[PDB]
Amino acid sequence: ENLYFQSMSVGFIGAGQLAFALAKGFTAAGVLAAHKIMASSPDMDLATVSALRKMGVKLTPHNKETVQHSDVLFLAVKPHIIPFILDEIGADIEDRHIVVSCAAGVTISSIEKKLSAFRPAPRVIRCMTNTPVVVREGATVYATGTHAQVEDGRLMEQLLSSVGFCTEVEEDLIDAVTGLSGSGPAYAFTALDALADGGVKMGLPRRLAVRLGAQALLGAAKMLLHSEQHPGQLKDNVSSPGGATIHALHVLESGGFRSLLINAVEASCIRTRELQS
Amino acid sequence: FQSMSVGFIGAGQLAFALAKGFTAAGVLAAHKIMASSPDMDLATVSALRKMGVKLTPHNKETVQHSDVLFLAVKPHIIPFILDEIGADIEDRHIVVSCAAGVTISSIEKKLSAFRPAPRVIRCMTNTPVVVREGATVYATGTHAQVEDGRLMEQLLSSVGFCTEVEEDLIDAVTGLSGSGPAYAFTALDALADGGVKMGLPRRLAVRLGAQALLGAAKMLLHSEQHPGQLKDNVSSPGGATIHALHVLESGGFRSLLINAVEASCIRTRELQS
Amino acid sequence: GTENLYFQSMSVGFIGAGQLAFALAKGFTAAGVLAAHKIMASSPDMDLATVSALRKMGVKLTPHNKETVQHSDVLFLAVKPHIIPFILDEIGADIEDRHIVVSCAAGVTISSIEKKLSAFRPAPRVIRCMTNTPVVVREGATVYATGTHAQVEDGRLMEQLLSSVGFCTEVEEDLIDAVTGLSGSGPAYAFTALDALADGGVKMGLPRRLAVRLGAQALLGAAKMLLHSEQHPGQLKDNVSSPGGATIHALHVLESGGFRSLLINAVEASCIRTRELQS
Amino acid sequence: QSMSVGFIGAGQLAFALAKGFTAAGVLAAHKIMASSPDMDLATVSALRKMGVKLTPHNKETVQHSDVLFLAVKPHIIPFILDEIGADIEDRHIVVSCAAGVTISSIEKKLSAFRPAPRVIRCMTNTPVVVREGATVYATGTHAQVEDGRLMEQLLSSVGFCTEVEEDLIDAVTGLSGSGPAYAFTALDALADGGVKMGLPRRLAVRLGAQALLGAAKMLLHSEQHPGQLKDNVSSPGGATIHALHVLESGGFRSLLINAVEASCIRTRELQSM
Amino acid sequence: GTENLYFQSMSVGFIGAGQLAFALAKGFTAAGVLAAHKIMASSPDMDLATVSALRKMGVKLTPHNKETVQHSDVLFLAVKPHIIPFILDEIGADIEDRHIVVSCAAGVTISSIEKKLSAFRPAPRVIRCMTNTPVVVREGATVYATGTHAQVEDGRLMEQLLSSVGFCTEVEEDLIDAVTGLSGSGPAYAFTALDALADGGVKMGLPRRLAVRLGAQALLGAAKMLLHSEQHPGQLKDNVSSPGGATIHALHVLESGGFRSLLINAVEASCIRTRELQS
Ligand SMILES: O=C(O)[C@@H]1CCCO1
Ligand SMILES: O=C(O)[C@@H]1CCCO1
Ligand SMILES: O=C(O)[C@@H]1CCCO1
Ligand SMILES: O=C(O)[C@@H]1CCCO1
Ligand SMILES: O=C(O)[C@@H]1CCCO1
Ligand SMILES: [Cl-]
Ligand SMILES: [Cl-]
C-alpha cells in the first residue's frame, strides 16, 4: 500500500514477454517508476521492445549498460542463452548486484560457478514466474543462492508480491513449479479456447462464449483461493443431483480429463529438467 | 433502488452466494433480504441466518416482503412454487427465475392465470458471485419494462459480469458458465495432483494452480489478443510448455471441454422437456 | 508469372536429375531468372521421366558429374543423403574458386560437406538448404544457412535465386532439421489431406474431380488468407465457425480425433528421422 | 455497370465478400449496402470503415440493391423473406448464401408476393477476402441465363466459381464451405509442431502456410493423382514416409472424411429445423 | 489370352460408357468372344476418357440411348442406381422380344426393373448382375440372377459371356447386396491395401516402383494359391509363419489392430449401403 523502492534500479537482460510483463506489473503496482528500469535485447525491433519504450523504460542494445544501470538484475532470457550472458557480463558484476535468473531449469549452482570465475560470492536468486504478472496476478516462487543475503530474499519477495502471489521455496521444487504455475497459463488458454468452441457449438456467439468461459474460470479460482474447502467439496456443492453439471463432469471423467492435466505438469517438469542437462 | 427489498424462494447454494455477494458489494443490507425454503435445517439456511438475512418457512412472507423475487429452486419445483404464490404476485414484482432450463413462456403462463402482465426475468448465474466474480446472463420477459432490465443488470453486475442475452442462448450459457466453475474445480484438483506427483506439497500445489488459472483468465479478459495468440506468446521453442501442450493435444484435451459444455447444455434442455 | 531478375553470368548445375532438380529448373526458367540452356543436370539413370522432362525444357543433360561441375558456377547437390559422400569424393578435385556448392540433401550438415571437400581444396563455398517441389509453381518454401567460407555475396545471391520461386529466408543451420519436418515434408502432408478431403466430398455425393478442385481451392485460399492476415489462425477459424453451424460441428469431430496432435507428431517424426539420416 | 449490391446480414460472410469485391474493384465500396439487426458488431464497424453504407432496416438494403445477398443464419431466412418479400422488385436477383436453405423454399416464400422471383443459391467461403475463394451456385426456376452468367463472373473475380446441381451444395458446404477452418486448425498445429522442434513461432507459421499454399497450387496445376505426388517426394527410408506413417496411425485421412461428413450432415439439419 | 467362344449372332449394347462399360468391352474383345464393332455404347457425356478409349478399341459410339437399344440384343445397363429409372423410362418403349436387359447397377432390384419396363411391354427379359473392373484383365468376379421372364437360355448365355472375362456364377438375387459388399467393392479394398503395403516397403527403404511390383505380386500369388488349394487360408497362413520368425511378428501387429475386424466392417458397410441405394 503505497510501497515504493526509492533507490532500486532494475535491469532486464532479455526484453521479451517476461521483461515487458514484469515492467508493466511493477509500474502498474506503483512500486517502481518506468524510467528507473532498463532493458537490453539483441533484437531491438521486437514489439515487446517498442511496448517497453512507450512505457518509458530505458532501452539499450548493450547488456553492459543494463548491468551498470541496475541494482537488481533480471536474466529474462532462454535457458541456453544464460551461459552466453553470464560470460558476457560476469566481469561487470559488482558488489551491489543481485542477479535474478528467470530462465527455466537453469540452476543456481551453474549460475554461481559461471560468475564465480570472474568474481567471488555473486548474489544470485532463481525464480519461476509467469506472464499474468502483467495484470498483477502472477504466480512466483524463488530460491536464494548461497551468497544471497537475508535482505536479498525479503527484498525480492516484496518486489514480486506486488505483481501476484510470491513465496520462497527450496530450489529443488522449481522444476515442478515450472510445470504447474510456470506452464499453467498456457493450459488455461488452451482450455479457454476450447470451452468457447463448446459454447459456439451450442449456439453462443464467439465473443460471448470467450467472455463467459474466462469469467467462469476466473471466478472458480478466486473461489477456491478464498475457500477453506476442498476443490472436490466445492464441485460437490454445485453439482445438482441428476443435473446438467454432473452429466458434463461424467464425460470429462470418461475421457480422463484429470489424468491429462497430470500428464501436462509431468511432461513440462520433465522437459524442464532436460533443459538443464 | 436503495429502498429495494429482495426475496428468495429456495435458500440453497445460489441464494447464499447471491446474498453474500449482494451484501459484500454493499448494494443490499442483509436485513432487506428474505429467504424461504421447505428445509429450514440446512447449513445454507443457518449461514444466511448469521449474515443477518431474514428467514421464514412461508413463501408468502417472502413474496409480500420482496420487490425483486429470485426463484432459486430446482427446475422441477418451479411449477409448484408458481402455483403456490401465483395469487400473491403484485404489480410491483420483478420475478427472476434462476432455475436451469425453465422457459420465460412457461412462467408467464402460470403467473398469468392469477394476474395479467407478470414481470418475469430469466437468468443463469453461478456460485462465484459469492466472491463477486460471477458470470450472469439474463433475458427479459414480455412484460419486463426496460427499467426492469436496467435494474437487473445493475444488481447482478455488482457481483460479477452481467449482460443481457436472447433467451434461446441460456441453455448454452448454462453448459458453459453455469457448469463451468465445476469444470475448473476438477482442473485445479487434478493440476494439484500433478504438482504433488512431481514433488510439491499439496498446499503449495493447490495455491499455484489456482493462481495460475486466475491470472490466465484475468490476463485474457484484459487482452485484445486471441487466446491461441497468448498460448503462442508464452510457448518457447522446444521448451517445457510446448511439450506439455503436446501431451494435452494427444489426449484430445480440447474436445473433452467441448464435450462437457455440449453435455451440460443438452441435459439442461432435457430438464425443461 | 516472372521475377524481375536475370542472373546473366550464372551457369547452374544439378547433380541428381530427379524431382527436386526438375522442379527448380522449371521454376527458375518460368520465373525468367535463368535460361534453360544455362542449366546443366547429370544423373546415374538417364532414362528417368524427370530427365526426359528436363530435355524437353531445353536443359543440358550429361551422364558425367564432372561435366556438370565444369559447366556450373552454382552447383546444386540434389541427391539423397547417403549419396552425398560419394558425390563429394567423385568431384571434390574438380571444385574451383568460383563454385558455390548448394547441398539440398536432408540432414547432411555443412561441417561434413566442408570436411569432405577440404581434403581436395581448402575453403569450399558451401550452402545448405531445404526447399520443396512447389518451387515448380513458384510457391516453394526455402531456408538456407551459409557455410564457413561462403562469402556475404554467396548467401545474398542464393536468396535472390531461391526467392524467385517461392518464400526464402536465411536460418541458423541448427533449425534446418526442424524446417525439414515442417515445410520440407509439409506438401506431402497436404497431398494426403487433399486426397482425404476429396474422399469425404465423394462420400457425400460430390464427383471426384469437383471434390479435388474444391478441396485444393479451400487450402490454397486459407493458406493465402493467413499469409496476408494480421490475425492468429484461431481467430480466422473463429470467423468461419457460425454458432451452432456446420463448420463447428466438423471441427469438434476433428478435435475428438486429436487432429492437431497428429500434425504435431508428424513434424516431430520427420525432424527426428532427419537427424538420424546423418548420424 | 450501374450495379448496386446489398447484404442482408452484416456478419463475417458479407464482410469478406464486400472486402473481396472492392479489392477486385468490381464495384465501389459505397455501392454496397448492408443491414444488420445489431449495429454494434465489429463486422458492422469494419464494413463501415471500408466505406460500405450501413442501415438497420432491411427494406432500405432491398430498395438500394440490384443483386441482393442473403447472408444470415439459415433459420433467420424465412423471417427475412416475410419482411422484405413485398419489397422485392422485378430487377432483383436474390442470392441466398445460407447453409442448407433450398432454392425451393425461398421461391415459395417470395412467390406469395410477386411471380417469378429470381433466386440463386450459392456456397462460398472467407478466402474471397484475398480473391481466392471457392464458390458454387445453382440457379432457380426463374433466373435467366444472364443471371447465372452475371453471378459466375461476379464471384469469379474473387476466386474459383462454377455452376453445380443444387443437390451437391450441402456436400460442397462440408468441403470448401467449412474447408478453410480445417486448414486454419491444420496450420496452427503444424506451427506448434515446428515450435516443438525448436522453430520460432513466426517462422513456423510462415513455413507451414507456404507449404500448404504451394502444395494446393501444385495439385491444381498437376495432371497427377495427389497420391502420386505424395509418392514422388517420399524418399525410401526418409523423413517424410516416417511422418506419413504417424499420420496414418492416427486415422488422419478418416478424421478429414468425418469432418466433411459432419459438416454436410449438419448443413442438412439446419434446413430441416 | 482367349476363350474358345464366339457369339456370332450377338450384338451388345452399353447404356453408360464409363469404367464398367469399357472394362467389359475390353475384356470381351480381348477374350475374342466378340468383335468390337458388334458392341455399341452410349453416354450423356461423350468427352469422357472412357468414351475415347472405347473409340480407340473400335466400339460403336452414339449419343442416343435409343440407337444403342435398336443396335443390341444383349443390353447392359451400366449406369448408376439413381439413373436406372430415367433410363428405363427413356427406352422402355423401344424394348423388343429379342432384348435381354442386363442391369449392372448396385442395389437396383429385378422387381423394380421389371415393374418399370412392364408399363411399356409385358414379360421383359431382365438379368441383374454384379461384376467388377478386373474383367478388363479377364479376372473379374461376377454373379447374376435371372428375372421373372428370363428364359433358361438367357442365363446360360449370360454365364457364357461373363465367364469369358473372369469367374461367374448364378445366385439368388437376395445374395447380390452382400456380393456387392465383397467382390463388387473388393478391388477397392485391394487397391488401398496395395498402396499401403508399398508405403510400408518404402518406409523400409524399397523404391516405390519395386515395392508396388512386389506387393501386387504377393497378393496375386496368394489369391491364386488359395483358389487352387484344398486348404483353409489359415493353414496356408500357418505354412508361411516360421516359428519365431518375421511373418508371425508381423501377423501379431495386424491382429493387435483388429485387421480382420476392419475387413468384416468393410463388407458389412458396403452391403448395408447397397441396400439403402434402392430404398
Ligand atoms: O447442475 C445443474 O443442473 C445446474 C446448472 C448449472 C448449475 O447447476
Ligand atoms: O515454455 C517454457 O519452457 C517456459 C517455462 C515456463 C514458461 O516458458
Ligand atoms: O458454419 C456454417 O454453418 C457456415 C457454412 C459453412 C461456413 O459457415
Ligand atoms: O522424405 C525425405 O526424406 C525428404 C524430405 C524432404 C524431401 O524428401
Ligand atoms: O517368417 C519368416 O521368418 C520367413 C521369411 C518370410 C517368410 O518366412
Ligand atoms: Cl515437396
Ligand atoms: Cl472394381
Author numbering:
A (entry chain C): -6 to 270
B (entry chain D): -2 to 270
C (entry chain A), E (entry chain A): -8 to 270
D (entry chain B): -1 to 271
The authors write:
Pyrroline-5-carboxylate reductase 1 (PYCR1) catalyzes the biosynthetic half-reaction of the proline cycle by reducing Δ1-pyrroline-5-carboxylate (P5C) to proline through the oxidation of NAD(P)H. Many cancers alter their proline metabolism by up-regulating the proline cycle and proline biosynthesis, and knockdowns of PYCR1 lead to decreased cell proliferation. The biosynthetic half-reaction is the reduction of P5C to proline catalyzed by NAD(P)H-dependent P5C reductase isoform 1 (PYCR1). Electron density for each analog was present in the previously characterized proline-binding site, which is located in a dimer interface and consists of the αK–αL loop of one protomer and a kinked α-helix of the other protomer.
The crystal structures of human PYCR1 complexed with THFA, CPC, l-T4C, l-T2C, and NFLP were determined at high resolution limits of 1.75–2.35 Å. The electron density maps for THFA and NFLP were unambiguous and allowed for modeling of the inhibitor at full occupancy in all five chains of the asymmetric unit. The carboxylate of each inhibitor forms two hydrogen bonds with the side chain and backbone of Thr-238, plus a third hydrogen bond with a water molecule bound inside the αK–αL loop (“in-loop water”). Three of the analogs clearly formed hydrogen bonds to another water outside of the loop (THFA, l-T2C, and NFLP). We note that THFA is a known inhibitor of PRODH and has proven to be a useful chemical probe of that enzyme both in cellulo and in vivo.
